[PDB]
Amino acid sequence: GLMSYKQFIQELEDDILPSEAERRYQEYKSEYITTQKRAFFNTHKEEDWLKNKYHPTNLLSVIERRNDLAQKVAKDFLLDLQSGTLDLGPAVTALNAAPKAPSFTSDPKRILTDVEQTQALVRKLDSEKKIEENVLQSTGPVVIIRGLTSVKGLEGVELLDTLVTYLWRVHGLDYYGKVETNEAKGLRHVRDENESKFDSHWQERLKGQDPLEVMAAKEKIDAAATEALDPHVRKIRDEKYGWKYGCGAKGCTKLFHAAEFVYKHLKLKHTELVTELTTKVREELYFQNYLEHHHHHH
Numbered sequence: 117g118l119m120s121y122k123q124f125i126q127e128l129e130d131d132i133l134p135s136e137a138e139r140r141y142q143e144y145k146s147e148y149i150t151t152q153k154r155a156f157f158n159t160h161k162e163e164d165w166l167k168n169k170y171h172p173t174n175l176l177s178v179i180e181r182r183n184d185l186a187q188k189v190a191k192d193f194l195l196d197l198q199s200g201t202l203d204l205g206p207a208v209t210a211l212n213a214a215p216k217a218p219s220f221t222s223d224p225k226r227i228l229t230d231v232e233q234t235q236a237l238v239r240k241l242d243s244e245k246k247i248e249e250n251v252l253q254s255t256g257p258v259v260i261i262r263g264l265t266s267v268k269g270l271e272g273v274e275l276l277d278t279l280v281t282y283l284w285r286v287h288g289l290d291y292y293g294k295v296e297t298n299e300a301k302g303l304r305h306v307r308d309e310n311e312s313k314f315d316s317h318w319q320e321r322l323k324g325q326d327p328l329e330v331m332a333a334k335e336k337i338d339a340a341a342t343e344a345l346d347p348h349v350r351k352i353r354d355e356k357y358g359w360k361y362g363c364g365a366k367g368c369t370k371l372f373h374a375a376e377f378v379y380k381h382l383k384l385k386h387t388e389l390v391t392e393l394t395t396k397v398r399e400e401l402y403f404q405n406y407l408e409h410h411h412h413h414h
């Protein structure tokens with residue numbers, strides 16, 4: 117446990133110095149916390165719970181399970197919409213009292229704004245997750261549901277509630293709660309300072325990328341993995357055909373016409389030479405994600 121200032125002083129009070137004390141306690145604080153965080157990492161670094169949160173390799177398949185689940189859940193969500201069998205309750209999986217939003221949400225003009233943003237988010241996250249067909253994605257937006265038995269038009273609050281629910285059930289995005297988690301649970305939030313940030317939050321979300329995908333940083337990792345392989349790709353001029361690129365592993369004599377071709381070849385015919393050349397970046401990023409994104413109690 118982190119010593120309060122009061123307690124730290126005591127094993128020094130022999131020849132006291134007020135400002136040497138503050139220097140040392142600050143140092144103590146700094147060193148304690150860095151060390152606790154490493155300790156915790158080293159206790160759990162091996163467990164899958166932690167790896168599924170911060171490790172770039174695991175993340176990739178966390179994303180693939182997420183997407184598959186979502187596609188199937190959207191299929192189902194839309195079926196109940198189509199049959200008028202759908203519930204707009206605040207549960208994550210309903211038929212299977214809630215936290216309230218900052219009351220700037222009472223506003224009926226808010227509704228017109230929320231419908232666009234909401235439909236914008238559904239479009240974004242559907243693309244991210246490869247959900248391809250969705251009816252839910254001058255005037256405000258109108259959606260017509262050609263059902264089994266009969267049609268339903270959706271326009272204002274009803275369209276809004278359908279969309280908000282969709283976001284929560286399929287994408288674990290709690291619109292009114294300004295939060296999205298990978299395996300959301302429980303009840304989503306129902307209906308100046310707050311209002312400018314609310315839009316900002318969701319607007320930058322519309323601009324950026326999937327949080328999980330950002331964690332996973334696959335681009336960054338492929339880049340770093342390719343760089344590590346450079347020493348093992350011989351560049352050679354051909355007498356006629358420009359540059360040919362030769363594989364620099366041992367026992368091996370294969371020749372390729374582009375550099376990407378050698379990289380691809382290396383992680384298929386020299387798996388372990390690659391694994392050995394690329395472990396550090398993966399595991400350093402693992403460590404870095406944990407440090408940045410994990411709530412530590414101190």
Ligand SMILES: [Zn+2]
Pocket residue numbers: 363364365368369370381382385386
């Ligand atoms: Zn080779």
